[PDB]
Structures are given as C-alpha cells and as structure tokens.
C-alpha cells in the first residue's frame, strides 16, 4: 500500500515562564515512532516503538543535535510572527508544522507536505507542485517572498523526493513486521432499560487495531442512518482502540435489531444481536 513519514512540530511560547517549549514527533503510517520534547530531563530524541531501538548511538546523536537547532530556530519564528502580526508581546502563541511525505508502492513520492500554522490557523503551506507556496494572509506573504528568494521550495523538493522517502524506506524495513500487526475487535451488546418502555442497545468493539472501524445498527436489513449515538473511536491506552454505537428501540422488540462490525482484522464482518 502507500506509506508515510511525517513530523509534527510544536513550539509554544511561555512569556515569563522561560524559553518556549519545543517538540518534534515522528509518525510512520500515522504511528508515533520518535519523539523530542524540550521539557524532559535531558531533552533527547527518543524511540517510541521497540523497533526503533535497532538504531545505534550515531542516529540519536544526530537527531538530537538537529532538533536543538530547529528548537533555537523556532524560538526566533515566534518573535518574528508576533512582529509580523504586530501583536502584544505578553501572550502565549503557537507554531505548528507538518512535514513529510507519502510514497506509493513503488517507493516514489506521491505527496509532500510542508505546512505551517500560527496560533492554530493555516499560515503558509507548500503546494502540491513542490515549487510554489500558499500564504494564508499578508503576514505569511513576507515569508513567501523571502522563501521564493531563498529557493526554499527547491530545497524542500529535494528533501521530500530524496532524503525523506529514503528514511521512510529505512524505517519501513525495521518496523513493517510491527506496523502491519492487526488486532480484530471483540464485540458484545449491552442492554440498558430506560423510561418509558424503550431501551438503549449499545454495541461495543474492543481491543482492535488499527483504529479504522465502522459500526452499524440495523432493523431488518436497513442501516439506521440516525439517530443512534456514536462515540469517537478512542484509545484504550495499550495500543488498541475502542468504539461503541448505540440505538434506542421499543420495549420487547430488541431481537429485530442487529449490530454490524466492520474492521480489516475480521475475515467476515460481525453481526451481533441482543
């Protein structure tokens, strides 16, 4: 299938409470595998999956040093942005970045990302052509004009077509046996009587992975497209995820309803019935 390597960067200023807090978090196929955080004992790049411990001391030493440079650099961006927007120098502000690539099955680049946000909102992004930028307002245009003059798009294109996909291939070789791990859900229906003369059927799916799940309730072969309570898929806090969908039914009529669970772990989708 496709694969991705993406880094989610955060710098948040704490006026008076010291230097801004800085962090980099790395994802392979949307699973955290490295993390840097300025607010640890000795801020280090850390492995976040057992299979990243196959890297030797050189790797962590390079990425830790690189992160300290990016940190110092984002401390300046925060001061720069406050000036561009001509804001008060007292409040806390945030910069976020999404940076990385998606590659098809041949291992070649499908999409590259270079997304900045200031204070939760789009600031500048690298377009899909990997040559031009989209600025979100006039402050971001100063950055655009500067980055056009620096050849920043060319520098990013080289990174995303070369360095980035090469590291992703490196990471895939070590992690593939773990990242393709699939855990099928564990389903059961619960029953909760309510006033008056109707009852809440709640269909549970537990311990599944990946979090990609679909749950439906049905009356005699029709998807009760609402209303029917759904819960945002949630981590159980151990690598697996949870989710439930509930529907309200008349008293005595429970057996006419069926719950359906769709997940890549299941050969056949689950049908459950109170």
């Amino acid at each position: 299938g496709p694969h991705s390597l993406r880094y989610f960067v955060t710098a948040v200023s704490r006026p008076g409470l010291g230097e801004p807090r800085y962090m980099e978090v790395g994802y392979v196929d949307d699973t955290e595998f490295v993390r840097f955080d300025s607010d640890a004992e000795n801020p280090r790049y850390e492995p976040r999956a057992r299979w990243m411990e196959q890297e030797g001391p050189e790797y962590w030493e390079r990425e830790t040093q690189k992160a300290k440079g990016n940190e110092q650099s984002f401390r300046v961006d925060l001061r720069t942005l406050l000036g561009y927007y001509n804001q008060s120098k007292g409040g806390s502000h945030t910069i976020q970045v999404i940076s990385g690539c998606e590659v098809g099955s041949d291992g070649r680049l499908l999409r590259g990302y270079q997304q900045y946000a200031y204070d939760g909102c789009d600031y500048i992004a690298l377009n899909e052509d990997l040559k031009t930028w989209t600025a979100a307002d006039m402050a971001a245009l100063i950055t655009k004009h500067k980055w056009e003059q620096a050849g920043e798009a060319e520098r990013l294109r080289a990174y995303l077509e070369g360095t980035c996909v090469e590291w992703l291939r490196r990471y895939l070789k070590n992690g593939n046996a773990t990242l393709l791990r699939t855990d099928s859900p564990k389903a059961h229906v619960t029953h909760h009587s309510r006033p008056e003369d109707k009852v809440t059927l709640r269909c549970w799916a537990l311990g599944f992975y990946p979090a990609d799940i679909t749950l439906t309730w049905q009356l005699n072969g029709e998807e009760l497209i609402q209303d029917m309570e759904l819960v945002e898929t949630r981590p159980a806090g151990d690598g697996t995820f949870q989710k439930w969908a509930s529907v309200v039914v008349p008293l005595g009529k429970e057996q006419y309803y069926t719950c359906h669970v769709y997940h890549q772990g299941l050969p056949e989708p689950l049908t459950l019935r109170w």
Partner: peptide, 8 residues
Amino acid sequence: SIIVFNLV
C-alpha cells in the same frame, strides 16, 4: 529524519 527548518 526531519528536515532542518529555515526562518519564516
């Protein structure tokens, strides 16, 4: 490996 970033 994350890229080294430039200044906005």
